[PDB]
Amino acid sequence: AVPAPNQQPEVFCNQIFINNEWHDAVSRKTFPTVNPSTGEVICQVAEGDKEDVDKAVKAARAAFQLGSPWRRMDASHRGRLLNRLADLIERDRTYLAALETLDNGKPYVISYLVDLDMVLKCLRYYAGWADKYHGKTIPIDGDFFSYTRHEPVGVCGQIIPWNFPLLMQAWKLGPALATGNVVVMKVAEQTPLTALYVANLIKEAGFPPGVVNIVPGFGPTAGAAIASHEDVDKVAFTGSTEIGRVIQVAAGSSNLKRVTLELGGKSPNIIMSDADMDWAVEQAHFALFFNQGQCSCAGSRTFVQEDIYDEFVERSVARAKSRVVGNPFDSKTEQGPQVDETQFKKILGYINTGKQEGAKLLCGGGIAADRGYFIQPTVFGDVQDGMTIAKEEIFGPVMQILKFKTIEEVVGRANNSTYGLAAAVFTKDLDKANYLSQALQAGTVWVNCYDVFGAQSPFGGYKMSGSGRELGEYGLQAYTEVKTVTVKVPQKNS
Amino acid sequence: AVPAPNQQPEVFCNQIFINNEWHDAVSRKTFPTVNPSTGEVICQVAEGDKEDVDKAVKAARAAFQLGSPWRRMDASHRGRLLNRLADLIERDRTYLAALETLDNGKPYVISYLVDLDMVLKCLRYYAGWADKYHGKTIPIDGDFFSYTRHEPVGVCGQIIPWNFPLLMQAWKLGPALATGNVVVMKVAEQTPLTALYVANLIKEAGFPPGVVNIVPGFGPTAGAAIASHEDVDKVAFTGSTEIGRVIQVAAGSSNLKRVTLELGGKSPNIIMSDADMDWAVEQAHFALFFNQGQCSCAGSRTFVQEDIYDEFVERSVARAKSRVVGNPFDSKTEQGPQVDETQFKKILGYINTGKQEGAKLLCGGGIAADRGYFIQPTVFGDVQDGMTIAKEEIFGPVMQILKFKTIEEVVGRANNSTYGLAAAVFTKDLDKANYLSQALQAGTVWVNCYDVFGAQSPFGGYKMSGSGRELGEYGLQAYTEVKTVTVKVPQKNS
Amino acid sequence: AVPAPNQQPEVFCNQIFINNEWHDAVSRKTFPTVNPSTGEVICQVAEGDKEDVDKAVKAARAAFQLGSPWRRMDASHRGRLLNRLADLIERDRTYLAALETLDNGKPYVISYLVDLDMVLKCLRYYAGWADKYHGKTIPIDGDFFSYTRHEPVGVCGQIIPWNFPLLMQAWKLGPALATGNVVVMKVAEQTPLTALYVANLIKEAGFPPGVVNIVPGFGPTAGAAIASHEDVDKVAFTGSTEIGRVIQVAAGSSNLKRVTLELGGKSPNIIMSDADMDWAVEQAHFALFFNQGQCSCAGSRTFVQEDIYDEFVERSVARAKSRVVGNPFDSKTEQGPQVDETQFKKILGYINTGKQEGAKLLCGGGIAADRGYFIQPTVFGDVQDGMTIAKEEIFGPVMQILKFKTIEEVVGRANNSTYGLAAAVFTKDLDKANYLSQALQAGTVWVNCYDVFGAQSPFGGYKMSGSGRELGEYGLQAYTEVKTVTVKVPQKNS
Amino acid sequence: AVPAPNQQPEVFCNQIFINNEWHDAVSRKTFPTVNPSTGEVICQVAEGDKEDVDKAVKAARAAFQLGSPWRRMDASHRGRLLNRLADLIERDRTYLAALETLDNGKPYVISYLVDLDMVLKCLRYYAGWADKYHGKTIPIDGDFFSYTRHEPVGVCGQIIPWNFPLLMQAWKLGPALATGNVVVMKVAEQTPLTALYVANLIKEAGFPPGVVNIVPGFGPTAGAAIASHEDVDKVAFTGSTEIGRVIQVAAGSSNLKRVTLELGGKSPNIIMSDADMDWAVEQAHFALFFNQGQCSCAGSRTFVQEDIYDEFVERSVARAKSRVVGNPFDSKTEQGPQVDETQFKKILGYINTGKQEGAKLLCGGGIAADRGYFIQPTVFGDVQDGMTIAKEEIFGPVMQILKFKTIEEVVGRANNSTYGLAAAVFTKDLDKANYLSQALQAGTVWVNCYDVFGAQSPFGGYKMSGSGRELGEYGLQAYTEVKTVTVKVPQKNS
Ligand SMILES: NC(=O)c1ccc[n+]([C@@H]2O[C@H](COP(=O)([O-])OP(=O)(O)OC[C@H]3O[C@@H](n4cnc5c(N)ncnc54)[C@H](O)[C@@H]3O)[C@@H](O)[C@H]2O)c1
Ligand SMILES: [Mg+2]
Ligand SMILES: [Mg+2]
Ligand SMILES: [Mg+2]
Ligand SMILES: [Mg+2]
Ligand code: NA
Ligand code: NA
Ligand code: NA
Ligand code: NA
């Protein structure tokens, strides 16, 4: 059951958050954030730039000083603070879900049941790691006692995208805070509002000032200031592959800060002829269309074995034509608008390219409403590997269906990509499932499902889909600096 | 390639091994060991008893003293010694395989290609663990540094059976020595010879005196003396469920030594109607008949789905009738004799029991040769769950085939046992494989295979099939005593 | 800050708890529990025996059936329920602390600030483990996929003592519930009340019926029924070394259930000449006198280097004479009564023995009040290793001070014990601290502190102080049954 | 215990190694490598450039194809191959130690007893990891089975320096090969020879062609070609902080390959007034002067507490004045030449700067012989933090001694560096040791020792000394690509 929304939630936080206080930008500039369902401005937001980032980094560094409240805090108590934050978000769940829908466009039912549930589960998962990520005692040769300390990496710059604003904030804050780091976060200009409200909850939860600082603003200004900063120890970036390159170059060109990247995808979803047809059709639809198609790991190359191709396509088209596009606050709506004008235009561009290059348009193909950034669910059949829509990340409700004959053929075609974020296989056969899950070059392989995320299981890219992993125990690795301490002892014994 | 065997290998070692030297029993008693293919005495062996065990325990305790060569030795160097021991066993592989066949009865080709290969792999695997089983540094509350040391448990009594004499010795020595323990081993009275030769190789490898001591002799004398010893810290026993109970009671009645047990089985091998028939028949044959049926994990309840039952049984009877029983030094031999007269009689008793209780005798059922202890490969059909031959471990070449209808039914029937050592499922279906491997109450579940052991993967029982695990990283747990050290520090920081 | 206690709290729960309901004993018998500060009966409690244990085990087995709510529950949700339980205990903290004082005798300020705090920290720590105790994927040889599942051991019998009633309950329930086991718990006859109230909170928190069952009653009746039960998979026992032997024998004589034991101690507390004198005197006092001396790990052999002996003894005696013995609800009280008349008499017996065998009585030595079980803080000087008071666990406010000269001497004397639960070293010297922490044969070594427990760091015995470990990640091992699944695959690749 | 060297060892390998074959450079160009003891050319070496790297990367990629001999090889067998390689290096130890001395300049006794020993220990350690770096099975929410595979990262570019040619090769090849990667290694132009002979032994050991490829040549040609290559998945670079920046920028600018960096240092060695003087002096001397000062972790800021400063400096000067500089094949020689003329001149430049900026020249300060690149052991006293010789890595036999008063002062001064590779503390006091080891911002902290490396314990930088760790279990992390497989199952149970 979903509690009724407030379809026009008040905005309470719209400034830069440093040392648990709200600041205007040094410049006093602000930028609009827009409701993509109407095209109207919600409010102005402080436009942070290099000077605001510098204030935030200094606050983070101070909070990280040896002997500070955050450094001296018991690891178990960091876990208590993460659990308190989750409880505050749960108290404010309908507000945050409605604000998420207002600013991003996704259906309120999904913001409520999916995004907010996933945020809670991620924070509560990482609360549990705070006092369990042990270092080692090590049986080195000779008369020595050797051990490692797992220390925090330090001041962590965290740059996140607009597609799942709250969830991406939680994927970053969970592991960083569980391990005792401090954060300077740059939220997406398209969707800054929910993360700023969460900062108020961070203060309410009792995190020391300077442990989390949030600088809304643009990428080449505030984002680049983080990535190039001389006193930021680590940057974690989620966004496009194009900008990932910019981040890695900025790290190398500045202070050799540690880098992890979660980038784009063109994930293959492989339907073998023995798959359960009804389930495969529904999951392939979800795999592509979830979140207005705005998912890094979207199943955007649907490979279907030739003996079931015609039926699969018929059913897929029927399901796409039935998908309800509308006001994301209406309970019947399955698909809201795209996040903004830039994305709307890019997706229409890709649709035009698909038409021009001779893919078979089977449904949709155009705008879905006269106001707001709504696009019809669009399906192309008879897609070929060299087509632009088979290669480039579209990030909208545009499905590609490709036909194949053999399992060996489809492995090669699935893997012939510079992306490698996710993939899936639908089959009833044990051996085909094991053959494909081993052979696919992707960070997550789903078998008979898609978009199954768990705070316990890592996620991230092969190839140019990124480096490092988020979620699970693995998500702690990039937030830890390892120190070996090797001590002379009188006489080592086993 | 298998090198030609010496069919009458010389015996060099037949005494008690303490402090790297050979000793008679205090009583000067010896016992004969018999070649089960001919029924003739091979030689006599020192008959160790309580006073010999007491000498061995004192030697091991002395080798374990703080400051001793074995306690000071670098962990990496324990790994080098295990690797040297494996190289010496490899040098003497053809000799050891023939001596194993002479004393135990198994085909020389199998001693050579299987037993000795698995010994080498077990020792080389554990050599690699010697310097890698780390303790932890722990983020405890307060101004403390807390960590754990993984220390050796100490003097380990290790009692092993006769069915895989060299391999059982290696499964015990590998983890115990990798972790810096010292050992008093009691080898089976039926097959003492190969383990005693390996003691010569332990000295040759360079292990300090007293690190491994071996006492051949009987169970209620030397075995019980180890189990009840006031200065043995840990006992690892492999053998019958009946004697496991005796060991656990001895431990509780003496000094509360730590105990692990690897006991009997009545493991179910489940053939679904979609299995590959030819492979399932061959694997079900192997699963039961391997090693003259003398395997704790033998697939001794073969459950076969009703639609494929008649064909599976026809094929199984044909394969059992074709199985070549004979001199284990002849390369054509698939099945040697049972290990001794006691086991021979017990198996004849169980064959008669199956006949008396109305199981359908489909082939075999009698004595296979004049000399030695050879039994025909025997297959019973239409076996029912309440039959004694369906419940009790037979430990010979006697196959039980049961019919079932549904996957839900077979889970309940397979699990309705007080044993729980292993199980298998043959199916092409991903979901049936996952359903059954989850639901079966067994320490190892094989899927489309049987008797697949790896030094890397743990093995051990549910229920009355044992407690604890051998092999893998898990095999190190029982050989480690954990010490927490918690140190006051001036000011704890993350 | 400590809230004012209800000095005569009401009792709401005094029956057997099975399937989330309250039951009389089948026999309808009850037994009294006494307030040790007054010697008066608080109330009657249902007297559970074998028949009530049988009902509880059947309930636990049913709750453990494959497909049950508790088996199907997400691991993360088990963590949520443990966190809910902790929140309910915190809500009822003032009541539970007063009830603990009423039934056990410990000072209310300690119940509130120490026991209840530690209960909350233990449950919250293990809540975090619920979804983090991973099995392994294992690179076995050959064309196979091999992995382990960490499954619950099953029906766990848990038998606990009276010295820290709520904390001992939490140390058992935390790991068992985090790993998905079900429990039949036998609480101490001397202190049943607080654990029964916590059962009401387990129901309130939402644990499925049958997951936790609690049977108050006596040892040889209800305790033995659990230890010998044919359908209990695992027993975890905390109590005397004498009864540990009984439990281990019961397990071996019944169904080979898995066993862990947390037993007695006679722990050495070593004060080197270079210790900080004031700190060492205060910590040595705490080490022995904490919880009316009723701590398994009490520092009951205080070894003091000869050059500082006279001053340390003078200061220690002054501290003992200043220790306020009285009503445990009075804020000034440092020491309450002993738990019952049996213990009261036994401690007085040991004080008599100490006098008879030639130890120097420095202070105390008798009863401290004419009502309730109060004993004077008692210090014996010039104690020798062979004295009964230097060997046997007294479990009361009776301190032994022994003199030593050298570091080798004290290691050897500390280790000449069949106990090995804990030890401590007070020294400023790095090399002395490392030499002694390595050389001492004890499950926990404290350096410049004592009785520093954390849910993160394991605790348990060497030698006859126990086997297995509680707390930390280690505390999950005995609650896990390991299953290997090994699957044939078309072609294994790295 | 050192075999007499061949002082003019023959060179057998001087070409590019690709697919287990020797190749000239495509250009046919060669470059000289010089014997630094004489300044004379040993031989010419193939001058690899971009086209040679391209051939190497293609060969590595082919060897990494799914289904190849290296991809299908059992993990345990990778370990056997590493052990065989170590055996071959041991067989050729005397030759390799002499060749190392000839090309690098370090004393032969040290090549033989230290470098070659450490190479053997590294490879044998990693051999043991090959089949033990498990992935996880993960208790995700819902009806799923989720697990991770630890797969190889793929084609690994490895760029190494000249200071420990064989050891740096081993630190790279050990973890990369244990985890099943393939390698394109670029050895330092100053010391290519020993790594090329090791390639011959890699072929001899049985590694499949293309698994290890070695391209000698210069940095901006062959090194840059690897760092910028579009089909190299990971680069591991050891060298100067300056070139580390170039590598990270190349990775970002090309294909977003994974990067680890092991860079320079200016490590503080802190001597407290309570240190053992004789030991601290000798260890401080070793800390700085080991390997002609050519060690990334050299203790090049020796901080000495004011009370012991004068004595420490007097003893340090006596030791530096007696250090034997000479022919590295002479057993009396403690210090050989610097590796080449460039380094020789740089070090003399630093000595000049030290004198100019007002450090007190206490001994040495000039050239030590008329031929070869020999420099006198040089000690500067009264060094201050702002002096060039206190900030910049000198990488030669030039010691800086700084005075301090308090432990708080020295933490701040030690940590006021953009380097953070190592540090050490000399003290007898437990609390000072723990205070400093926690507070020092360095990847390794030695206590009462220096330059204690073990294959078991990780090593790497904080700050601009690098990112990632080599050695230990940690050394495997950067060579692993993690894949999550999440499988729908009929009904998940614990
Ligand atoms: N952290 C460690 O474990 C470690 C170990 C040894 C040496 N070092 C450091 O190494 C340095 C000394 O070694 P060096 O003089 O060989 O260092 P360097 O940076 O000059 O060269 C190291 C390697 O990189 C190559 N290289 C040079 N320019 C390159 C370019 N533009 N692109 C790609 N590769 C290039 C070189 O040819 C060589 O193989 C010191 O700073 C020392 O501290 C660090
Ligand atoms: Mg953008
Ligand atoms: Mg027997
Ligand atoms: Mg009692
Ligand atoms: Mg250079
Ligand atoms: Na918006
Ligand atoms: Na025999
Ligand atoms: Na009571
Ligand atoms: Na050279």
DSSP labels, A246-298: HHHHHHHHTT--EEEEE-----EEEE-TTS-HHHHHHHHHHHHHGGGG--TT-
| D458 contact residues in A (CB cutoff 8 A) | 148, 482, 484
For domain A2-264+455-494, give its CATH number from 1.10.760.10, 3.40.605.10, 3.90.1150.180, 3.40.50.720: 3.40.605.10
- Check if D72 contacts C (Cβ < 8 Å): yes
User: What six digits make up the tokens of D37?
Assistant: 């003891």
CB < 8 Å to C431, chain A:
489-490
**Cα A491 to averaged position of ligand 1 atoms, centre (Å):** 37
Ligand closest to the CA atom of residue B241: 3
CB-based contacts of D32, cutoff 8 Å, min separation 6: D41, D42, D43, D44, D45
Is the distance from CB of A91 to CB of C136 less than 8 angstroms? no
The neighbour count for residue A62, using CB atoms within 10 Å, is 14
> For chain B, what percentages of helix, strand and coil (3-state, to nearest 5) are there?
40, 20, 35
Task: State whether residue B145 sits within 8 Å of chain D by CB.
Answer: yes
Min Cα separation B396/chain D (Å): 33
Q: Which of A80, A145, A456 sits opposite C434 (nearest CB)?
A: A145
Q: Which residues pair with B487 in a beta bridge?
A: B145, C447
CB-CB under 8 Å, C138 with D134: yes
H, E, C per residue of chain D = CCCCCCCCCCCCCCCEEECCEEECCCCCCEEEEEECCCCEEEEEEECECHHHHHHHHHHHHHHCCCCCHHHHCCHHHHHHHHHHHHHHHHHCHHHHHHHHHHHHCCCHHHHHHHHHHHHHHHHHHHHHHCCCCCEEEECCCCCEEEEEEEEECCEEEEECCCCCHHHHHHHHHHHHHHCCCEEEEECCCCCCHHHHHHHHHHHHHCCCCCCEEECCECHHHHHHHHHCCCCCCEEEEECCHHHHHHHHHHHHHCCCCEEEEECCCCCEEEECCCCCHHHHHHHHHHHHHHHHHCCCCCCCEEEEEHHHHHHHHHHHHHHHHHCCECCCCCCCCCECCCCCHHHHHHHHHHHHHHHHCCCEEEECCCECCCCCCCECCEEEECCCCCCHHHHCCCCCCEEEEEEECCHHHHHHHHHCCCCCCEEEEECCEHHHHHHHHHHCCCCEEEECCCCCCCCCCCECCCHHHEECCECCHHHHHHHEEEEEEEEECCCCCC
- The residue type found at D124 is R
CB spacing of A466 vs D256 below 8 angstroms: yes
Q: What is chain A's alpha carbon radius of gyration, rounded to the nearest angstrom?
A: 23
Contact criterion met (CB below 8 Å) for D185 and D196? no
DSSP, residue by residue, A317-355: HHHHHH--BS-TTSTT-SB---SSHHHHHHHHHHHHHHH
Q: Which two tokens stand for residue B297?
A: 């994990």
Q: Which tokens is B459 given?
A: 């093995």
Q: What resolution in Å is listed for this PDB structure?
A: 1.4
CA-based torsion, B201, B202, B204, B209: positive or negative: negative
The Cα-based distances of C247 to B261, C161, C213, C218, D245 in angstroms read 17, 14, 20, 14, 64
Q: Which of D238, D300, D419 to mutate to test the pocket of ligand 1 (most atoms within 8 A of CB)?
A: D238
DSSP three-state, residue C435:
helix
Residues 6+ apart with CB under 8 A from B339: B36, B104, B105, B162, B163, B190, B191, B292, B294, B373
C-alpha of residue A107 to centroid of ligand 6, in Å: 14
Interstrand relation of C480-488 and B444-447 (parallel, antiparallel or unpaired): parallel
The whole-angstrom separation of Cα C176 and Cα C28 is 30
| CB contact set of A119 (below 8 Å; sequence gap of 6+) | A86, A89, A166, A167, A169, A170
Provide CB contacts within 8 A for A342, sequence distance 6+.
none
Chains in contact with A, where contact requires at least 3 CB pairs less than 8 Å apart: B, C, D
The three-class DSSP label of residue B137 is strand
- Cβ-defined contact of D67 to C429 (cutoff 8 Å): no
Report residue A223 CA to chain centroid gap. Answer: 16
Distance, in Å, from the CA atom of B128 to the CA atom of B460, rounded to the nearest integer, reads 22
Secondary structure class of C41 (helix, strand, coil): strand
Q: How far is D315 from chain B (nearest CA, A)?
A: 32
Determine the Cα–Cα distance for residues C283 and C449; give it in Å rounded to an integer: 7
> Whose structure tokens read 């109590």?
C239
Give CA–CA dist D184/D157, Å, rounded: 5
3-state secondary structure of C270: strand
**What is the Cα–Cα distance from C189 to D13, expressed in whole angstroms?**
81
Residue B87, SS3?
helix
* Contacts B71 to A, Cβ<8 Å: 493-494
Is some CB atom of chain A closer than 8 A to the CB atom of C139? no
Q: Which of A246, A248, A437 sits opposite D485 (nearest CB)?
A: A437
Q: Which two tokens stand for residue B56?
A: 């061995």
Residue intervals of chain D classified under CATH 3.40.605.10 are 2-264+455-494
DSSP code of D223? I
Give C192's Cβ-side CA count (13 Å radius).
30
User: CB of D475 closer than 6 A to ligand 1?
Assistant: no
Are D224 and D250 within 8 A, CB to CB? Answer: yes
Q: Which two tokens stand for residue C305?
A: 């280097």
- H-type helices in A18-115, by residue range? 50-63, 69-72, 75-91, 93-104, 108-110
Residue A276 touches partner B, C-beta closer than 8 Å: no
What are the chain A neighbours of D244 within 8 Å (beta carbons)?
A: 256
Helix (H, G, I), strand (E, B) or coil at C151: strand
In chain A, residues under CATH classification 3.40.309.10 are 265-454
DSSP-assigned letter for residue C275: S
Q: Which residue reads 């194949």 in tokens?
A: A404
CATH (residue range C265-454): 3.40.309.10
Which amino acid, B28?
Answer: R
- The ligand minimizing its distance to the Cα of B239 is 3
What CA–CA distance (Å, rounded) separates D347 from D437?
A: 31
Distances (CA, A) of C414 to B387, B392, C424: 58, 50, 10
Using DSSP's 3-state secondary structure scheme, residue C340 falls into coil
Residue with tokens 């700084």: D402
Residue A6: count other Cβ atoms within 10 Å of its Cβ: 15
Contacts of D255 in chain A (CB under 8 A): 418, 463-464
Q: Which residue of A has its CA nearest to B72?
A: A493
The reply to whether ligand 1 has any atom less than 6 angstroms from the CB of D397 is no
In angstroms, rounded to a whole number, what is the distance separating the alpha carbons of residues A487 and B315? 67
Q: 3-state SS of B313-357?
A: HHHHHHHHHHCCECCCCCCCCCECCCCCHHHHHHHHHHHHHHHHC
Q: Answer yes or no: are the C-beta atoms of C95 and C201 closer than 8 Å.
A: no
Q: What is the CA radius of gyration of chain D?
A: 23
**Which residues in chain A have their CB less than 8 angstroms from residue C130's CB?**
128
CA–CA gap between residue D478 and residue D464 (Å, rounded): 18
With beta carbons less than 8 A apart as the criterion, state whether D206 and D56 touch: no
- What is the C-alpha separation between A450 and A297, in angstroms, rounded? 9
Closest to C452 (Cα-Cα) out of C39, C66, C80, C118: C118
DSSP D358-425: T-EEEE--SB--SSSS-B--EEEES--TTSHHHHS---SSEEEEEEE--HHHHHHHHH-SS--SEEEE
Distance C359 CA to ligand 4 centre (A): 28
CA distance D255 to D230: 5
Distance, in angstroms, between A426 CA and closest chain B CA? Answer: 11
Ligand nearest to the CA of A223: 2
Q: Give the residue among C183, C209, C214, C198 at the shortest CA–CA distance from C19.
A: C209
Residues in chain D preceding a C-to-N separation beyond 2.5 angstroms (breaks) = none
Q: Where are the alpha helices (DSSP H) in C114-240?
A: 116-129, 165-178, 193-205, 224-227
Beta bridge partners of D214: D17, D185
Query: How many other β-carbons are positioned within 10 Å of the β-carbon of residue A365?
Result: 18
Coil, helix or strand for C235?
A: strand
Name the amino acid, one letter, at C433. A
Contact between residue A427 and residue A446 where contact means Cβ atoms under 8 Å apart? no
**C-beta of D156 in contact with ligand 1 (< 6 A):** no
Distance CA C366, CA C423 (A): 28
Length of chain A: 494
State which H helix or E strand residue A389 sits in: helix A388-391
The CA A259 to ligand 2 mean position distance, Å, reads 19
Please check whether residue D241 is in contact with residue D253, taking contact to mean a CB–CB distance below 8 angstroms. no
Our answer on whether the CB atom of D291 is closer than 6 Å to any ligand 1 atom is: no
* Residue D368 burial (C-beta neighbours within 10 Å; 0-12, 13-18, 19+): middle
Which residues lie closer than 8 Å to D416 by C-beta, 6 or more apart?
Answer: D385
Per the listing, tokens 């190497």 go with: D56
Phi first, then psi, for residue A181 (nearest 5°) are: -80, 175
Q: Could you tell me if the CB of D216 is within 6 A of ligand 1?
A: no
DSSP secondary structure of B391-447: HS---SSEEEEEEE--HHHHHHHHH-SS--SEEEEE-SBHHHHHHHHHH--SSEEEE
**Residue A270 near residue A426, CB atoms below 8 Å:** yes
Q: Are strands C135-138 and D135-138 parallel, antiparallel or unpaired?
A: antiparallel
With tokens 């004959």, the residue in question is A405
Distances (CA, A) of A367 to A328, A374, A376, D58: 16, 6, 6, 47
Is-contact B119 B16, C-beta < 8 A?
A: no
Closest partner residue to B134 (CB to CB) among A77, A137, A491 is A137
Which of B149, B445, B467 comes nearest C256 by C-beta? B467
Which among C73, C137, C428 has the least Cβ separation from residue D137?
A: C137
> Ligand 3 mean position to B347 CA, how many Å?
14
- Ligand 1 close to Cβ of residue D419 (< 6 A): no
| Contact yes or no for A239/A263 (Cβ under 8 A) | yes
CA A246 to chain CA centroid, Å, is: 18
- The C-alpha angle with vertex D472 and arms to D197 and C143, in degrees rounded to 5, equals 80
- Residue among C136, C462, C486 whose CB faces B452 most closely: C486
The secondary structure element, H or E, covering residue A473 is none
Work out the number of other CB atoms within 10 angstroms of the CB of residue A311. 12
Say how far apart CA A260 and CA A280 lie, in whole Å.
Answer: 33
What span, in angstroms and rounded, lies between the C-alpha atoms of A166 and A171?
9
Extract the tokens encoding A66.
């040896």
Tell me if D219 CB under 6 Å of ligand 1: yes
Q: How far is CA B57 from the centre of its chain?
A: 23
CB-based contact, D139 to chain B, within 8 Å: no
- Quote the CA–CA distance of A226 and A209 in Å, as a whole number: 19
Residue contact C484–B444, C-beta within 8 A:
yes
Look at the block and give the residue holding tokens 């002829």. Answer: A273
* Rounded Cα gap, residues A270 and A427, in angstroms: 9
Helix spans in C376-459 (H): 407-415, 430-439
- Residue A190 neighbours by CB under 8 Å, 6+ apart: A33, A103, A104, A162, A339, A340
Q: Helix, strand, or coil here: D484? A: strand
What span, in angstroms and rounded, lies between the C-alpha atoms of D13 and D8?
15
For B312, half-sphere exposure in the C-beta direction (CA atoms, 13 angstrom radius) is: 34
| Three-state secondary structure call for residue A33 | strand
CA C330, chain centre distance (Å): 25
Helix (H) or strand (E) holding C220: none
Flag if A141 and B76 touch (Cβ within 8 Å): yes
Last residue before each break in chain A (C–N > 2.5 Å): none
Structure tokens at C262: 């947390």
CA nearest C365: which of C390, C396, C322, C338?
A: C396
For residue D224 and ligand 1, the question of a CB distance below 6 A is answered with yes
